[PDB]
Amino acid sequence: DSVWFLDHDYLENMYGMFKKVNARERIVGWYHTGPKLHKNDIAINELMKRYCPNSVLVIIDVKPKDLGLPTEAYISVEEVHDDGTPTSKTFEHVTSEIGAEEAEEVGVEHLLRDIKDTTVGTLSQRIT
């Protein structure tokens, strides 16, 4: 995993272009696609900051790591850890939420009639 391919320039080009399609779409950072958080990811995190304003590392997986969202948000941290070990560079997680803008909401609500976490319609809905 210390051999991989990435095009850095591409990050810069994309930033300008996305602005025309919507104003709310600018370079926020980069996405990783699982399965864990690797050492090899740390090299790209460094690099991303220069290209992006400071970046975020969000890991979007194809299958949840829990039962809720498949996304984790991370920020690089340096912390002293003691047990016979030195100071470690790690990624400290920050919790995530869901949320959308009005356009997105309209299509998902008409299309949905699934069972969900809960819909709400009965007492029995609540037990699920």
Binding site: S2, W4, H8, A43, I44
Partner: peptide
């Protein structure tokens, strides 16, 4: 150098 990655790609431009 470092963890090995493709820094810039093939393009007709030597400047890249």
């Amino acid at each position: 150098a470092n963890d090995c990655e493709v820094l810039t790609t093939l393009t007709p431009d030597t400047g890249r």
